[PDB]
């Protein structure tokens, strides 16, 4: 009695410090025994309601945890308040790192919390939040935490990883840029031949070949197409050919092309007869492009010097020009794949370098303003 | 005699206690009690007096968390829904109720397999956890939706498997872009290849043993004109490419559009006539910042369109007026016109009613206009004929 109060007092002090405890036994039908019964029943009742509350809260945070896409939410201000695992991985971040931070702290792309809360925007970030060169492209869409009153609790962003789709896009973008750039010169050749030859179809002293080199060129352009597609969706072939003859074919093409008619001189600096195993087509591609920008960059007429010499390291072919070529800012990048697409406005010749490397060859360049550019190709 | 009093006070304190605690068991909070300072019933009364505040504090905090989470998971942009070992939808948020045109109520009467006879089971959906795609109405008017649903493995606080978690992403616009871009590259291919296989089939006749005897000049004509078509096409394609890579940006300079137009149209009457009716309207200073190069691209292209659309009577009317917020340029021709079904389609790349000859051109025009923050569209009756209208900011 005096004791039962000590005991029950104890039980309740336990319940206070969060420590649950078994029921006390109802001794008599006393009036406080009713109180003992009531405290028992309370400890149990609130126990259930508690385990239940935590059960559902947990179910929620569980869903958010094992969820596939990334989710984060912020106060009206915009400091991160919630950020799930997935979002953490996508953004290269821990909950720790994230909670002292603000959505605007995403690559500092200069948009405002109010722009955000007004427009509930659907936009796309790009970052290397993944250690090495590996990148990730994330599409983040926003929504409001609006309460019934209209009050905005904060922001709710979902981040889908679209880092692949981005790729497939730059691949096809790439294909278009390529096919448009690479068909140019063969197309201009076929033009020049059929064009000059639209007057001079007779002159069988030239016409039989004319038609044939133009035919071979449109056939080259088709095998070109298939290649360029498969590049984002290549293949090599080789035969032994007379290389001086090669350069004379290739160069005679350009020669003809310039004879009509707007507004540069190229001199063969080989000698006569060099035999080497290569792919006619793809080598023609390489030389074609190198000559392309060689002429492109050359001011006032043209100093374009094709000088090729042979040794025991075999073929060493050089193409020299005027104008400028430096700095070492552009120099190293001009051979990298996505250059032509991701640029800021050089030329191309990545595919050139690659057709050279597939020949187990080397291809470098030196160039200085008001001196010109020299490209060099080394074949086995 | 005040011993009786003491008994009274105590028992009444205990009764008061049973009041408070019985009212706790029912989940209702009542005011603190009066301490018998200093009885030992004071200690108990005060203990319950605190216990209440405890239950309440904990419950309010936990509640706040649970509700933060709850709001986040429903007001979030994507469809979310959870299930149990069965697959029966246990959870579904706003966005998902919308994407699926259902209600939490009628939705929870559903199991996850309940879609278009999907042909997948829970027992093989938990293993693969792999995402896939459904196209469904589930939305209002003339429109249909497409959902990318990524499945995920749900679990408890213990290792055990709770059920499934599906996120549904309304990705119809994305899907649309993707599709049309694909068709774009496909087009570039077919479109360049077929002139090639054409010119190749000709030159191949001009060598296989038919070289320059009977139809030669005509084969050189065909082949030449065709390779020039491929030339122009590849030029257009380069331009569009620059536009797609956001490299091709504008260069604007405040110009008198009325004069610009006269220059351009003189230039045009020129470059045209060798082997058509051009009618001018403006006649007054219309100062507007444009990129003369690009804008000339546009106008020249639309004029050429007008031409490719006429028998010989042309009748191209350039008519351009100015409201207080816009310059309205319009190029009208009494030609064939355009099917109302091709009408919303003609500015598409490599889209042609029937060619018959490009073939982008019109696309470039639209894109440049859009670059000026303007608009352009077609109208047609098939008689009289098609007319294109461009809208540009101010003057």
Author numbering:
A (entry chain A): 37 to 269, 275 to 304, 309 to 390, 398 to 432
B (entry chain B): 28 to 302, 309 to 390, 397 to 434
What text comes from the article?
Bacteria respond to transient living environments through transmembrane-integrated sensor histidine kinases (SKs), which act in concert with their intracellular cognate response regulators (RRs) to elicit necessary adaptive responses that are critical for their survival and virulence. The SKs and RRs have evolved into a two-component signal transduction system (TCS), whereby stimulation of the SK autophosphorylates at a conserved histidine residue to initiate a signaling cascade. The VicRK in S. mutans, which is an important pathogen in caries etiology, regulates acid production and tolerance conducive to dental caries, including proton expulsion (F1F0-ATPase). In addition, VicK has one HAMP domain and one PAS domain.
In this study, we report the crystal structure of the entire intracellular portion of VicK (aa 31–450), which comprises an SK dimer with one signal transducer, one signal sensor, and one intact kinase domain. VicK crystals diffracted slightly better than 3 Å; however, because of strong anisotropy, the final structure was refined up to only 3.3 Å. The overall structure of VicK comprises a dimer in the shape of a long slim rod. In addition, the HAMP, PAS, and DHp domains are organized as dimers, which are connected by long, straight coiled-coils of helices α2 and α6. The VicK HAMP domain appears to be a stable four-helix coiled-coil with classical knobs-into-holes interactions, wherein three pairs of hydrophobic residues from helix α2 form a central hydrophobic core with knobs-to-knobs packing, and it is unlikely that structural alternations of the HAMP domain play a central role in signal transmission. The VicK PAS domains form a unique dimer, which is mediated by a leucine-zipper. The dimeric architecture of these domains looks like a butterfly, wherein the DHp domain (aa 199–269) is a four-helix bundle of helices α6 and α7 with a phosphoryl receptor histidine located in the middle. Interestingly, the two monomers of the DHp domain bear an asymmetric fold. However, the upper parts of helices α6 and α7 are remarkably different, wherein helix α6 bends ∼25° at Pro222 toward the central DHp axis and α7 moves ∼11° away in the opposite direction to avoid a possible clash. Although the overall conformation of each CA domain in VicK is the same, their positions relative to the DHp domain show dramatic differences, which generates an asymmetrical ATPase dimer.
